[PDB]
Ligand binder design. Structure first.
Ligand SMILES: NC(=O)c1ccc[n+]([C@@H]2O[C@H](COP(=O)([O-])OP(=O)(O)OC[C@H]3O[C@@H](n4cnc5c(N)ncnc54)[C@H](OP(=O)(O)O)[C@@H]3O)[C@@H](O)[C@H]2O)c1
Ligand SMILES: NC(=O)c1ccc[n+]([C@@H]2O[C@H](COP(=O)([O-])OP(=O)(O)OC[C@H]3O[C@@H](n4cnc5c(N)ncnc54)[C@H](OP(=O)(O)O)[C@@H]3O)[C@@H](O)[C@H]2O)c1
Ligand SMILES: [Cl-]
Ligand SMILES: [Cl-]
Ligand SMILES: [Cl-]
Ligand SMILES: [Cl-]
Ligand SMILES: [Cl-]
Ligand SMILES: [Cl-]
Lengths: 482, 482
């Protein structure tokens, strides 16, 4: 019983998080399905550390101080269940397993309940920050069996990104799958932000005809203002980056985006619970569309765009327009994200601290933005805040960007530039701010062909069927949603 | 053994389909969970028919000619499984159960396999056309256990809508859940169409300031050309329709769209299998957004739109623009739908006849369109057609609408009119026709923060990790999708 904690999984996240814990003075026992990788790790990256290895689960468990604490950082899915099944017979009541991978929240909820019945404390925790964050200070979103929290708080908050006054970007999120749900939403917002950034870049490149380094500079400048954020920052660096041959690397890269599930899950959750998280939807679909690379090559030969477009305006003015469009859309991204969190708390009874979640994102986090503090403030003033757009800071920002936003989109449309996210964000804003929508026509159509019934504005809750054609029956469908 | 067939479920679809079969000379045994409704039906709507009723399943089954044929038209979900469980003990090998409701295809696949093992032939069939279609001639999309097809073909094709030369809008779709899958896609396309129509109506109302009856006329006119279709037709009727007090009915209707699952399922399937069916996604979320009626009233108080917009152009010219925009977007809706069908065939091994499916939609069907014949022709010319937009008829149509399309959207944007479907449709067109997309930047970002690796254009399939920051490690994540 010499090791403070064990970690399973020796890819980018596992190796780096191990070294982080080591640097903070914790003895860590490393393990991996492919056992050869343990030795390779101890002989290289962990060469001069306190890290110890195991050749088997049995051995790994035996090295742990009680209550034993084991972290899993492996590919999400069956692998996590595989390890749990093997560990349970080796563990004692009160022992703790922490899944730090990108697992679906429903899986986490299930595992949490199963293991609790067996006396084992299960934590499902989101980890943000990628390689760098794992190595030096990640954002941690722990949820599950809170009985575990007291036994992991010290390590977790110990290694977590610290901000300003030294406050850790890691606090208990809530019960069962709450941690992984929050992490899911984190990735939804991330997907959205990345896609919007791509659309800005596409406008800079193809409407304004800017050079790679010129665009790098634009992002670098944007990073000093309201758009101050991790993603804007690295985009600037990416645009600057030169390959060993002196040419820029980005233009050499294949334009087919991968995805590993979290974005998709966010969109699916939104659909299942009826939350209009439109940006994430378009972001995921945009990745799918880019995957059709071969099709797009084919299509580019037959489908023509706007034939006669030339940008005849002030490039500098339009660049600023792009900036403001990006800012407003970024705001919608986050607002939708928080709508989804609020909906989850309602669906599952999780007591989520929205302001707190915002604070956890200030460091070691992919969606770190200068305005996360503003989000916290918003929920402080009004914990029941129904939407970020209703808070003054965000309402004002969007109001100030609105003109530029519409200008950028209209121009984009005229130029033939794909802006799935810019447009969906604006459509959402325009939809959400409208007291009357044409959805009443949808109701009329449904009642007309399917007898689904509808309600009058003047008396909501009472459903009616109308004999639209004058030749229909009286027997209608029932009024229900599904 | 006097009845030819039984049907369970006495709401709009069931009552009407029973009367349809009765008119074609088939003796039908009616049943329902709430048995009192059986007698009510025989005493009223079926008062002068050959319909017979049962007071129990046992009694209903005993009235059927072998092989026994039972149709289920009840609310999708558990209720279907409930009846199957109760029926199986009463049935003989070779008997046939037909689920005509809007069931999820995965449920249908499962039921089909389970019952096959028990000697019972299961058909899952989509039914289109609503009340009027059920009553006089529906589109029928039968799939499941093909051993049943010969035993139901006569009745099914008998009551199905007939087109032109008298060909029935009903043929065998494919194995297991294929029928219900096709039906799901049908509803996806339908949701998309309806939402597009609402957006055109919104533009007519709020940009062009047209009167109800004037807009009614516009749709009536549009229904004579390329937009000739069921939904355009009924929209014209709905706009004209006056309540008992002489005022138009539509403006009295509450602005909150319901949904019963199929649209949502389509979008989810699309996400799960990586097909960019963007229109259905926006259509479903638009309904969700409309449901936030109370929130929208609140938001309309705080969130301002474009302050200084006045339409200063030719109304007639812009009305035509809207028409062309609608047409192009409608085309995208169907194109996306068939991409999903193609994907399903691949995923599940279903041998789907795309042209045949288009033909089934020509009558008694909510998405009846004048150009369904064109879709059939396209797949005739090229059964491997990867996308409708690649066919000359559709390529040309979109090419001719393109200008008006962008004009409509750009104007809509400036006026502050929500166009989630118009804009997603156009974004998708612009994305799909582009050989190069900014997705390369997403790949760069992913590799930069998460070491997800990427490929070079010049050598696809070989994944690389780059040390973007110059201070990172060599251990990356693995390259995989999920
Ligand atoms: N309405 C349309 O235009 C449309 C078009 C095509 C297909 N469909 C599908 O066809 C099916 C029938 O649609 P519909 O609109 O006619 O009726 P519905 O409103 O969807 O369902 C009402 C029928 O389902 C029965 N039912 C509800 N819950 C039940 C339960 N728990 N156990 C047993 N029976 C139950 C009701 O029986 P009780 O009388 O005892 O309550 C009634 O007979 C549905 O699956 C629908 O999705 C609908
Ligand atoms: N990469 C990131 O920037 C990022 C950021 C935050 C969180 N995460 C999440 O954290 C976890 C680790 O991510 P990662 O990128 O470091 O690695 P990864 O590529 O997602 O997974 C590789 C690790 O999982 C193990 N593994 C794969 N399949 C397995 C199976 N069937 N049974 C047992 N182990 C299996 C591998 O073991 P072997 O060596 O034996 O093959 C290896 O240790 C993932 O769940 C990921 O979603 C990733
Ligand atoms: Cl991640
Ligand atoms: Cl605490
Ligand atoms: Cl050609
Ligand atoms: Cl339907
Ligand atoms: Cl045949
Ligand atoms: Cl106010």
């Amino acid at each position: 019983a010499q090791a403070d904690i064990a970690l399973i999984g020796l890819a980018v996240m596992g190796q780096n998080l191990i070294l982080n814990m080591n640097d903070h003075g914790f003895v860590v026992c490393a393990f991996n399905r492919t056992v050869s990788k343990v030795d390779d790790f101890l002989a290289n990256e962990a060469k001069g550390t306190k890290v110890v290895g195991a050749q088997s689960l049995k051995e790994m468990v035996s090295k742990l101080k009680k209550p034993r604490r084991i972290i899993l950082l492996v590919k999400a899915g069956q692998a996590v269940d595989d390890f749990i099944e093997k560990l349970v017979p080796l563990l004692d009541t009160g022992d703790i397993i922490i899944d730090g991978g990108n697992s679906e929240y429903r899986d986490t909820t299930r595992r949490c309940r199963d293991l609790k019945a067996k006396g084992i404390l299960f934590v499902g925790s989101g980890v943000s920050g990628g390689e760098e964050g794992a190595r030096y200070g990640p954002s941690l979103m722990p949820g599950g069996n809170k009985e575990a929290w007291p036994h992991i708080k010290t390590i977790f908050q110990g290694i977590a990104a610290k901000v300003g006054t030294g406050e850790p970007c890691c606090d208990w999120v809530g019960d069962e799958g709450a941690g992984h749900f929050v992490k899911m939403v984190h990735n939804g917002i991330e997907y959205g932000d990345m896609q919007l950034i791509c659309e800005a870049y596409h406008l800079m490149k193809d409407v304004l005809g800017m050079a790679q380094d010129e665009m790098a500079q634009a992002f670098e400048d944007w990073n000093k203002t309201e758009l101050d954020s991790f993603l804007i920052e690295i985009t600037a660096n990416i645009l600057k980056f030169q390959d060993t041959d002196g040419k820029h690397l980005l233009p050499k890269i294949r334009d087919s985006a991968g995805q590993k599930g979290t974005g998709k899950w966010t969109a699916i959750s939104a659909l299942e619970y009826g939350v209009p998280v439109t940006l994430i939807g378009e972001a995921v679909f945009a990745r799918c569309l880019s995957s059709l690379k071969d099709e797009r090559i084919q299509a580019s030969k037959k489908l023509k765009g706007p034939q006669k477009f030339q940008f005849d305006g002030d490039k500098k003015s339009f660049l600023e327009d792009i900036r403001k469009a990006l800012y407003a859309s970024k705001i919608i991204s986050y607002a939708q994200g928080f709508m989804l969190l609020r909906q989850a708390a309602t669906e599952f009874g999780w007591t989520l601290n929205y302001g707190g979640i915002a604070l956890m994102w200030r460091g070691g986090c992919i969606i770190r933005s200068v305005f996360l503090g503003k989000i916290k403030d918003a929920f402080d003033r009004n914990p029941e805040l129904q939407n970020l757009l209703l808070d003054d800071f965000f309402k004002s920002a969007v109001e100030n960007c609105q003109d530029s936003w519409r200008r950028a989109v209209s121009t984009g449309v005229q130029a033939g530039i794909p802006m799935p996210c810019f447009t969906t964000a604006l459509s959402f804003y325009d939809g959400y701010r409208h007291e009357m929508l044409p959805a009443s026509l949808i109701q009329a159509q449904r009642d007309y062909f399917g007898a689904h019934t509808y309600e009058l504005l003047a008396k909501p809750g009472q459903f009616i069927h109308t004999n639209w054609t004058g030749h229909g029956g009286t027997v209608s469908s029932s009024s229900y949603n599904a």
